[PDB]
Each structure stands twice: as C-alpha cells, then as structure tokens.
C-alpha cells in the first residue's frame, strides 16, 4: 500500500508497517493520472538513475 508519514510517501507491505521508499522496483505503471479517483502527485525513484548519471 502507499502511505504517508505526513511529509514523505512510502510503499509498505500490507500487514506490518515497514516503509520502503517508492521506486520502479516496488511499483508498476498503468496509463496516466486522469483515470484514477484519488491519485496523488509524488516522485518515484529510478534505481538506474545514479548508474546512468556516472
């Protein structure tokens, strides 16, 4: 599930609060932001970015 500690957005396993920083590894894409009732804006981190920035 996505959750917020009031400042930052995390994804957690459902049955035990363990906050993981949101990435392309723990999330999957579908479509665009128009179709969903209740979607929120946030960054999603790309683990390949610092590997490509080097």
């Amino acid at each position: 599930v996505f959750v917020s500690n009031g400042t930052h957005w995390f994804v957690t396993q459902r049955n035990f609060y363990e906050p993981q920083i949101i990435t392309t590894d723990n999330t999957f894409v579908s479509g665009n932001c128009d179709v969903v009732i209740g979607i929120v804006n946030n960054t999603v981190y790309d683990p390949l970015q610092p590997e490509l920035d080097s």
Binding site: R14, S30, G31, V35, V36, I37, I39
Partner: protein, 49 residues
C-alpha cells in the same frame, strides 16, 4: 473502500489497476446489481423458499 476493492481484485488474480481505471463502471455495476436484489425479493416470494 476503493483501496479495499483493489485488494479484493489483487486476491482473484486481476491486477489492481483494473479497478481504479474502471472504478465508476465497477461502482455502477455494484449499485445496479444491489438494485436487482430488491426487485428479486419484492417480486418473487419463493426466493425465501
């Protein structure tokens, strides 16, 4: 409740984006199907058989 029903979809092996991208359709089908229960129970006493 739209996030609970996205767990219910994940449980049956339908990927949860299928709910959020069809949420008005799924809500209107649930609301219409709840409408049919009233007509069934009102019209046909042998439903309680």
């Amino acid at each position: 409740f739209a996030m609970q029903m996205a767990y219910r979809f994940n449980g049956i092996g339908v990927t949860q984006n299928v709910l959020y991208e069809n949420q008005k359709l799924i809500a209107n089908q649930f609301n219409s199907a709840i409408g049919k229960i009233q007509d069934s129970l009102s019209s046909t006493a042998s439903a309680l058989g």
